[PDB]
Amino acid sequence: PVARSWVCRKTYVTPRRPFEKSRLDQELKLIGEYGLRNKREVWRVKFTLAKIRKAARELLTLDEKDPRRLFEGNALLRRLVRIGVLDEGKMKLDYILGLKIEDFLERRLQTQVFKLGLAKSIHHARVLIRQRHIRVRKQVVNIPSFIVRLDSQKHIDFSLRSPYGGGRPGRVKRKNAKKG
């Protein structure tokens, strides 16, 4: 006996057919558009979407007056409005089925850092985040797969320490300044 938990979960599902043109293209488009590292990151978002869709599908089968369906449905919709893949108008359980991978990949910190014009390329954003230049609220995050909340969007600023923002020259600038 030991005081440790063994609650570990797989976050991606591999495709049934390993080599298939039309599919490989579609995944590489997603990588190319949102500068993802490998196809695991696309399968991760497919798996999460699939689980949300399966939850919506298994909720639909219950009657419209059931307390459980009402409570669970509202909670799911609230969370998907909170994360920012829907709006208050389209907040019906039926519309959960009308989402896709694009909607979820748009909410990556990498994507938002590129879309707000902090970085000048989708590839630059991932590096900039990973190099500890970017911060949300007063918290320095270096996770490209940080899924940004709707209300947390309006402040992604450069971390104050950073050379780009804070105002402290790095190794290259220091070395060039000493030999200048």
């Binding site: 006996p1 030991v2 440790r4 938990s5 307390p67 409570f71």
Partner: protein, 258 residues
């Protein structure tokens, strides 16, 4: 196995203590006493986890061994002593008195009482017997055997005992239209009024209880405790008035407060 068990694994402890998984392998293991192991509360949990006074296990025995804590007006230094339903824990150092009442969601809540109310306690009579030259006897849910009871006290009635003495001040009969509380099963901690009982000979008697908010539920006779005469309680209630309000308005209340 051979002889009685002495340990208790952490995950095997009863859920209403809310011990987390990672802190250790073992648990408190309430020692033998008036209340059952499954339905009691160790002082180590009450002090450390609920009142947030002690951090580690040593600080709890450092509190208790200095003899600052009484249970029902009697000093207990045993940190794993079982204090259960209606038991009054008294801290005369800081002048704080608590009665152990179950809350709505079915666990012992940190419900403070005035020092004037920490004088008596209500108790459900388990049996009634007589022996040795006929001095009749009574036995209650917290194992307090009392001699010469009032002959109007029958089985499943409630009695109010002054803690300084060991004598019955007043008693409540178990009849229709009396305020009761559930102490076992799905409906644990719900307060309501008796509507009727359905006697099943050679089996458990089932009672029907109507809540203050028009909610009607059933329960076994063994898991009933009369707390009030008519509708008026003889003790203070927890934060909520024992009203089981559902997840819908739980969310509405939580979001309304925000």
């Amino acid at each position: 196995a051979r002889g009685p068990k002495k340990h208790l694994k952490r995950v095997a402890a009863p859920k209403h203590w809310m011990l987390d998984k990672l802190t250790g392998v073992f648990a408190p293991r309430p020692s033998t006493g008036p209340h059952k192991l499954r339905e009691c509360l160790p002082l180590i949990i009450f002090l450390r986890n609920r009142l947030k006074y002690a951090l580690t296990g040593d600080e709890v025995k450092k509190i208790c061994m200095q003899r600052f804590i009484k249970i029902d007006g009697k000093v207990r230094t045993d940190i794993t002593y079982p204090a259960g339903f209606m038991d009054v824990i008294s801290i005369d150092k800081t002048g704080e008195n608590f009665r152990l009442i179950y809350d709505t969601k079915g666990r012992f809540a940190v419900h403070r009482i005035t020092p004037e109310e920490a004088k008596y306690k209500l108790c459900k009579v388990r049996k009634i017997f007589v022996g040795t030259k006929g001095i009749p006897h009574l036995v209650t849910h917290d194992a307090r055997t009392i001699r010469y009871p009032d002959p109007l006290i029958k089985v499943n009635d409630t009695i109010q005992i002054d803690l300084e003495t060991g004598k019955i001040t007043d008693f409540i009969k178990f009849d229709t239209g009396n305020l009761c509380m559930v102490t076992g099963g799905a409906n644990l901690g719900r307060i309501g009024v008796i509507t009727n009982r359905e006697r099943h000979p050679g089996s458990f008697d089932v009672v029907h209880v109507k809540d203050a908010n028009g909610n009607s539920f059933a329960t076994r006779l063994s898991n009933i405790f009369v707390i009030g005469k008519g509708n008026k309680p003889w003790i203070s209630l927890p934060r909520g008035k024992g009203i089981r309000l559902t997840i819908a308005e739980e969310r509405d209340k939580r979001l309304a407060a925000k």
